[PDB]
Amino acid sequence: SKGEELFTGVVPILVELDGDVNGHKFSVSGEGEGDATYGKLTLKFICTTGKLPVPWPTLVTTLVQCFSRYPDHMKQHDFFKSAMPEGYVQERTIFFKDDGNYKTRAEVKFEGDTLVNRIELKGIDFKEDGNILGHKLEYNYNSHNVYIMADKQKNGIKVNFKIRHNIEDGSVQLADHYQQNTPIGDGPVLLPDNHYLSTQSALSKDPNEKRDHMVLLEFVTAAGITL
Amino acid sequence: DLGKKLLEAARAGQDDEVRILMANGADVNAADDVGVTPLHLAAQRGHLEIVEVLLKYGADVNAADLWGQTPLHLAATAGHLEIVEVLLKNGADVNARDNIGHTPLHLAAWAGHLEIVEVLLKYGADVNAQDKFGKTPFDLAIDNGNEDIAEVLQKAADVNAYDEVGWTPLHRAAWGHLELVEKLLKNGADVNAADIDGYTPLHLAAFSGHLEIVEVLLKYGADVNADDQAGFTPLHLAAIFGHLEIVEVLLKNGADVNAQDKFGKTPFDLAIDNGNEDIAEVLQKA
C-alpha cells in the first residue's frame, strides 16, 4: 500500500462536522497537526455556528485514528494508514445509556498534504434534560481501550469500545461505540489481527478564544501483538 | 510581519533570516494562533543553531503552547538530543507538564529516545512523575515496547497493580505473553480482575485467540462465564472470532452455551452470524 509513509512526519489536519441532534443543527471545524510516529494530535475545534448544543466531550471520538502510534512490530496491522491517501469511510453508532444515540459517517482522506476528517452526525431520541442536551457532562476526558477487529468477512475493519463521560455529580455516562471502517479506494489494505489502541486525551480552553471551542491534546498507540 | 517571518524562518531552519529578522524589530517571543514560538519550531524541527540563537536573544525557554507543550516537550519527543541539553542548560523546566500531564521524561520514554531519558534523568527528571492518567514514564515505556528505557527507568527507581482503565499486568500479558501470564499467576495475580469495561484476562485472551493463555487462566481458577459489566462471556468472544480450540476448552471447563450478551445473542447465534460453521455445529450438541 505504502500509505503509512504519508505519516512519517507532522501532518496538517482539517476536521469538518455538520451535526444535528434533535433538530439542533450545528457545525464544528477543527484544525491542527497529527504526528503518527508518536501517535500525537494537537488540535483545536470551533463551533462555527455559535453555542454548541451538546457537550464537547461527546464529539471527541467523532472529531483520525490513522494518527495512532503503530509500532514497527505492528506495521502489518495499521488499516487506517493502509487506506490512504484515498482514505476510508468511518461509520459509528454511539449509544448513551438511558439516553439517545449519535450516528456518524466520516470520510477520512487526504486533500493535498492535509488529512481531512469530514463528518455528518445525527443524534436522535435525546432527552432535553439528559446528560447531553442538558449539559451535565464535565469538560474532561478519560483513557480508553479501543478494540479493533478485521471485518466480519474481509473488506475493512470493525471497532468497538465503551467511552465513559464523567458527570458533574459523580456518576458516569457510558457511550457504547459500534464503529465500522471501510476503505474508499480500490487499492490494497491491511486487514489486521485482533488488537487494541490505548488512548489519552486532554481537553482545555484557549483563553483568547471567545467562541465555543475545544483545545484537544490526544495520545494514542496500538498494542497487543508482539514477537 | 516579523513575528510570522521569524516563526517561518525558525520553522524552515533558515538561521540566515533569524538573525536578520532579530536585527530588525522581531520579537523573539512571538506566538502564533496556538502559542507556538520560534523556539518551539526550532526545537521540534531539529534546528540547533537557531535554538542557541533564540535562547541567546532571550527566548522564553519555558513558553507553553495551548496544549501545555514546551520546546523541551517537543525536543524530547522529536528526539533532538543536543537541543534538549541546550534547553536544559538554559533553564528549561525538566518537569514541565503538558495538558495530559506528560513530563519531558514521559515523552522521551513514550517516543523511545533512550539518550534523552538519560539526559533528563541527569538534569533532575522525576522518575516517579505521573501524567493525569496515572502512567509513569516507566509504564509508558512498558506499554510501547521500549524495554531498555523501561529497564533504565526501573533501575532509576504489586502484581495486582491496576491503571486508570483497570488493567493489571495480567491483562497486558494476556495478549500473547504466555510465560508472563504463568509468572504473574504464580506470584498471586488475581485471575478474575475485571477492568473498567468489565473484561477479565480470559476475555482478552479469548478475544486475542491465545489458546495456551486461556488454558492456563482456566487451570488457575478463571471464571469461564465472566460477565459483570462486560456484556459478553469468553465463549461469546471465542465464537465471534472462529477460535474452535478456545470453544472446546471453554465448554470443557463449564462455559454456558445459553449465556446471552447484552444484545440477546448466544455464542451459537454469534457463530452463526460470523459464519463459524464448525463452532455453531459443536455448540449445537450443547
Author numbering:
A (entry chain B): 2 to 64, 68 to 231
B (entry chain A): 13 to 169, 177 to 305
Task: List sentences from the manuscript.
DARPins are engineered proteins that consist of 4–5 structurally similar repeats that stack on top of each other, forming a compact protein domain. DARPins combine all potential advantages of single domain binders over antibodies: they are small in size (ca. 18 kDa), possess high biophysical stability, have very high expression yields in E. coli, can easily be genetically encoded for in vivo applications and are devoid of disulphides and hence well suited for applications where they are expressed in the reducing cytoplasm. Structural investigations showed that these DARPins bind to different but slightly overlapping epitopes.
To connect 3G124nc and either YKKD or YRLK we chose flexible GS-linkers. Therefore, two linkers of 7 and 11 aa named GS7 (GGGSGGG) and GS11 (GGGSGGGSGGG) were tested for linking 3G124nc with either YKKD or YRLK. The resulting four constructs were named gc_K7, gc_K11, gc_R7 and gc_R11 according to whether they contained YKKD or YRLK and the linker used was 7 or 11 aa long. Additionally, a variant of gc_R7 devoid of lysines (nl_gc_R7; no lysine gc_R7) was designed. All lysines, none of which were located at variable positions of the DARPin scaffold in gc_R7, were mutated to arginine, methionine or histidine. The complexes crystallized under various conditions with different unit cells and one to four complexes per asymmetric unit (AU). All GFP-clamps form 1:1 complexes with eGFP, in which the clamp indeed wraps around approximately half the eGFP molecule and creates a continuous large interaction surface, similar to the superposition of the two parental DARPins on GFP (Fig. 4(a,b and c)). The buried surface area (BSA) of the GFP-clamp complexes is 1625 ± 72 Å2. Hydrogen bonds of Trp79 from the GFP-clamp to Leu44 of eGFP, Trp79 to Leu220, Gln81 to Lys41, His114 to Gln204, Asp143 to Gln204, Asn156 to Arg73 and Phe226/230 (numbering for constructs with different linker lengths, respectively) to Asn198 seem to be the most crucial ones, since they are found in almost all complex structures. Coupling of up to three Alexa Fluor 647 molecules per GFP-clamp via maleimide chemistry was straightforward and very efficient, resulting in the triple-labelled construct 3 × AF647_gc_R7.
